[PDB]
Amino acid sequence: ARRRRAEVRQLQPDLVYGDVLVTAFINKIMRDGKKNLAARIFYDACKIIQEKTGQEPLKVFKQAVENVKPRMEVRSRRVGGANYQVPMEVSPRRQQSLALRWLVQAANQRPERRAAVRIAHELMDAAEGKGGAVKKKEDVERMAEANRAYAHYRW
Amino acid sequence: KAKVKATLGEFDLRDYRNVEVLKRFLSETGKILPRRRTGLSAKEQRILAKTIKRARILGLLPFTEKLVRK
Amino acid sequence: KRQVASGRAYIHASYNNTIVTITDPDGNPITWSSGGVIGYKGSRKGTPYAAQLAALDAAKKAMAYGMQSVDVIVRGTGAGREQAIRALQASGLQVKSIVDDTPVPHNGCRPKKKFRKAS
RNA sequence: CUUUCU
RNA sequence: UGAAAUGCGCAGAUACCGGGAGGAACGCCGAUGGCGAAGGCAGCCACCUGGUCCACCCGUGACGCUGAGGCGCGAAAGCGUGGGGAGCAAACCGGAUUAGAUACCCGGGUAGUCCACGCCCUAAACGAUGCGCGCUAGGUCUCUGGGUCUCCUGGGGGCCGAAGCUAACGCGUUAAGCGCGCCGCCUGGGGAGUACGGCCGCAAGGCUGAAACUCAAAGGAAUUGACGGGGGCCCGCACAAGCGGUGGAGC
Ligand SMILES: NC[C@@H]1O[C@H](O[C@H]2[C@@H](O)[C@H](O[C@@H]3[C@@H](O)[C@H](N)C[C@H](N)[C@H]3O[C@H]3O[C@H](CO)[C@@H](O)[C@H](O)[C@H]3N)O[C@@H]2CO)[C@H](N)[C@@H](O)[C@@H]1O
Ligand SMILES: [Mg+2]
Ligand SMILES: [Mg+2]
Ligand SMILES: [Mg+2]
Ligand SMILES: [Mg+2]
Ligand SMILES: [Mg+2]
Ligand SMILES: [Mg+2]
Ligand SMILES: [Mg+2]
Ligand SMILES: [Mg+2]
Ligand SMILES: [Mg+2]
Ligand SMILES: [Mg+2]
Ligand SMILES: [Mg+2]
Ligand SMILES: [Mg+2]
Ligand SMILES: [Mg+2]
Ligand SMILES: [Mg+2]
Ligand SMILES: [Mg+2]
Ligand SMILES: [Mg+2]
Ligand SMILES: [Mg+2]
Ligand SMILES: [Mg+2]
Ligand SMILES: [Mg+2]
Ligand SMILES: [Mg+2]
């Protein structure tokens, strides 16, 4: 991206709840181009949200994501000598990407043997505020702000 | 902005006692103003600085001030 | 200890540290802080953030003496400076005036090599 | 940042 | 300080207010400014004193220019005698950095830097341009006189530029143009500002200044490039942001 600012690749709304953000997630779930298996998983997982709570899946997922978004992060930085960890605000896009990236990595760290379950529980835990995703995140928000001395670059 | 010379009538700038006049030629930090500001002829500005320096020793004018709200 | 309701905040910004010292209106110090008195040590005392924390600490210790307002007096140019000021302002402590009073020779003493550079 | 030599 | 450490600090430092001592240097004004023969000169006051510019066109009557040698002045550092010593700081004592670091950075620190008197006499002592005089378009900005003060006329400091000159760069009424006078100097590079001798100096050293040998160059200005731990503008899966790899195992 030397020249332009890159078009945000615009995404097919969801086949089922009609939401863009969901395909986005299904995609991060997806390996080796297998959108089918990926989508089973996310739907199968949404069904496990039903059976294990009177909650509508969509607004669980929505509110889980919203809980995993970092406000600030620490991007590394040269200072003609040293590389410092520099705290700075986080683009709405990047909030959303890092959220879904972490949801799925967090999911796949879990013990439960079947993907739809791990996806489901992690989601549940996250809306509640205590998924492994949110620790890999308060971890970030911590490290920025714990480096708040260097907030006087930002670049 | 507007020149300090242009804001006054006649005045003897050999006059090292007229602190009322002299004092508008100083800055908010009691520093002799440059010609860009004083609006003076070179020759005048020479004579000024001399008589400003006299007032100062007389106690009548400041060598310094401190800058207010900064 | 004594109740003084207003007095001076003396900021001393330098390229190595901000030190903020608070006094009664005759100039006797009540409390004081610095980048070192906060956690920091070494190069970090210089930061503007160090400045904020010291300004804030020293303002807190001063409100313990029932301080309400201050005349601020700044000296030296330094990263922490307008930051140290901005802290005091927004600290509960009320800032009546701000004044640069940085001391400067009417050329007098030979500087160290490092500060001659303008030679 | 860092870079003596070739 | 890049980051540090040495260092100072509970015998209470730093930061803050009040009083005192001392030493050294004068901020703004301050300039693309002024003055001096050069070196060089900057708070303010007084005394002593050198130069120089303009107006009047009053006086003398070629009394002029240059100038070997002599004599005097001559930044800094250095020297002698005696003061003084705040800050800075060769040497030196330490801390960092580094492969090492007899340096660059940090902390100390003596001479010295300051004054008087006496030496030294050098310099990128540079405009790298000897002094004096006459002559050859202008324009523009500036300091300082005089006039009939829009404009004219002296003296000084800059910039652009006629003619012209220059190897070129550039110079160009402040000549490096056109001419005259008088002085100093040069005569390939290295050896060498060395050796010797003389003069001077308390010393440090200074002035004058070779030869043997040896090279076929040493140089100046400008051209095209190339390069830069120079500048500006800009690209590329170059890095960043991502997703999957190699380096591990067997094959
Ligand atoms: N400033 C004074 C003048 O300086 C010149 O020289 C004199 C002084 O400058 C010089 O120094 C004096 C000294 O007098 C006295 N004994 C000690 C005093 N500290 C010094 O003082 C003077 O010089 C120093 C230098 O920075 C500073 O104090 C300050 O600049 C000045 N007041 O000593 C010289 C005589 O003692 C001239 N001779 C004369 O015009 C006058 O004294
Ligand atoms: Mg520091
Ligand atoms: Mg070698
Ligand atoms: Mg004091
Ligand atoms: Mg000179
Ligand atoms: Mg006559
Ligand atoms: Mg006659
Ligand atoms: Mg001398
Ligand atoms: Mg000397
Ligand atoms: Mg001596
Ligand atoms: Mg050392
Ligand atoms: Mg040192
Ligand atoms: Mg020192
Ligand atoms: Mg010239
Ligand atoms: Mg002229
Ligand atoms: Mg020209
Ligand atoms: Mg020869
Ligand atoms: Mg050349
Ligand atoms: Mg070239
Ligand atoms: Mg990458
Ligand atoms: Mg392998």
XYZ file of C-alpha atoms in Angstrom, chain A:
155
model
C 0.000 0.000 0.000
C 2.560 2.606 -1.120
C 0.162 4.418 -3.499
C -3.476 4.009 -2.273
C -5.352 3.190 0.901
C -6.669 -0.324 -0.112
C -10.424 -1.009 -0.652
C -11.912 -2.804 2.389
C -12.889 -6.111 0.796
C -16.705 -6.003 1.035
C -18.370 -9.157 2.261
C -21.287 -11.383 1.262
C -24.040 -11.013 3.909
C -24.859 -14.129 5.899
C -26.841 -16.979 4.325
C -28.907 -17.416 7.529
C -29.130 -14.383 9.879
C -28.385 -12.004 6.961
C -25.369 -10.384 8.610
C -22.005 -9.399 7.133
C -20.111 -9.841 10.415
C -21.009 -13.500 10.447
C -19.452 -14.495 7.128
C -16.392 -12.633 8.416
C -16.278 -14.964 11.365
C -17.094 -18.093 9.358
C -14.133 -17.123 7.165
C -11.694 -16.924 10.083
C -13.001 -20.323 11.107
C -12.352 -21.623 7.574
C -9.236 -23.656 6.673
C -8.023 -24.601 3.179
C -11.070 -23.060 1.361
C -13.649 -25.352 2.986
C -16.422 -22.817 3.567
C -18.953 -25.613 3.901
C -17.455 -27.447 6.858
C -16.602 -23.999 8.255
C -20.226 -22.891 7.992
C -21.662 -26.146 9.415
C -19.432 -25.532 12.414
C -20.640 -21.966 13.039
C -24.270 -22.927 12.606
C -23.914 -26.171 14.630
C -22.314 -23.923 17.220
C -25.236 -21.501 17.055
C -27.583 -24.427 17.728
C -25.483 -25.245 20.849
C -26.108 -21.679 21.988
C -29.855 -22.382 21.779
C -29.897 -25.679 23.628
C -27.594 -24.337 26.386
C -29.437 -20.949 26.790
C -32.729 -19.180 25.872
C -30.546 -16.597 24.112
C -30.745 -15.810 20.397
C -27.362 -16.877 18.967
C -26.833 -13.790 16.871
C -26.852 -11.350 19.819
C -24.580 -13.652 21.884
C -21.983 -13.586 19.121
C -22.423 -9.848 18.560
C -21.905 -9.154 22.242
C -18.968 -11.586 22.563
C -17.103 -9.803 19.805
C -17.859 -6.458 21.354
C -16.132 -7.844 24.499
C -13.013 -9.006 22.729
C -12.266 -5.764 20.826
C -9.112 -4.002 22.084
C -9.221 -0.227 22.573
C -5.457 0.261 22.520
C -2.512 -1.825 21.364
C 1.237 -1.653 21.308
C 2.877 -1.513 17.908
C 6.677 -1.861 17.960
C 8.829 1.196 17.051
C 12.390 2.263 16.083
C 13.918 5.270 17.857
C 17.320 5.472 16.135
C 18.749 3.017 18.651
C 16.013 1.155 20.481
C 12.727 -0.535 19.538
C 10.005 0.479 22.030
C 6.455 -0.808 22.459
C 4.264 2.188 21.623
C 0.688 2.464 22.827
C -1.949 3.762 20.446
C -5.655 3.728 19.510
C -6.994 0.947 17.302
C -8.769 1.372 13.991
C -12.398 0.109 14.079
C -11.431 -2.439 11.310
C -8.518 -3.692 13.281
C -10.723 -3.940 16.392
C -13.088 -6.139 14.470
C -10.387 -8.292 12.817
C -8.383 -8.908 15.989
C -11.582 -9.805 17.793
C -12.542 -12.518 15.303
C -8.946 -13.649 14.953
C -8.745 -14.146 18.698
C -12.155 -15.711 19.033
C -11.106 -18.549 16.767
C -7.594 -18.998 18.162
C -9.064 -18.956 21.645
C -11.706 -21.469 20.465
C -9.056 -23.835 19.168
C -7.005 -23.682 22.385
C -9.939 -25.232 24.242
C -10.145 -28.879 25.446
C -13.513 -29.905 23.962
C -12.929 -32.374 21.084
C -15.357 -30.949 18.505
C -14.995 -27.699 16.724
C -18.641 -26.541 16.907
C -18.547 -26.934 20.704
C -15.261 -25.025 21.205
C -16.633 -22.285 19.013
C -19.843 -22.255 21.039
C -18.400 -22.293 24.549
C -15.745 -19.712 23.779
C -18.500 -17.474 22.401
C -20.627 -18.019 25.520
C -17.668 -17.363 27.875
C -16.759 -14.254 25.870
C -20.154 -12.506 26.060
C -19.925 -13.203 29.784
C -16.429 -11.677 29.822
C -14.213 -14.612 30.706
C -13.146 -16.437 27.562
C -9.458 -17.091 26.826
C -10.029 -14.474 24.125
C -10.672 -11.749 26.648
C -7.490 -12.632 28.596
C -5.440 -12.460 25.307
C -6.926 -8.932 25.176
C -7.000 -7.373 28.611
C -3.416 -8.630 28.190
C -3.089 -6.204 25.240
C -4.997 -3.249 26.726
C -2.756 -3.834 29.796
C 0.522 -3.776 27.933
C -0.428 -0.583 26.203
C -1.061 1.836 29.043
C 1.565 -0.075 31.037
C 3.805 1.488 28.401
C 2.006 4.809 28.660
C 5.355 6.653 29.007
C 5.888 6.181 25.265
C 2.467 7.510 24.282
C 4.439 10.639 23.256
C 5.346 9.156 19.842
C 2.162 7.507 18.374
C 3.586 7.892 14.807
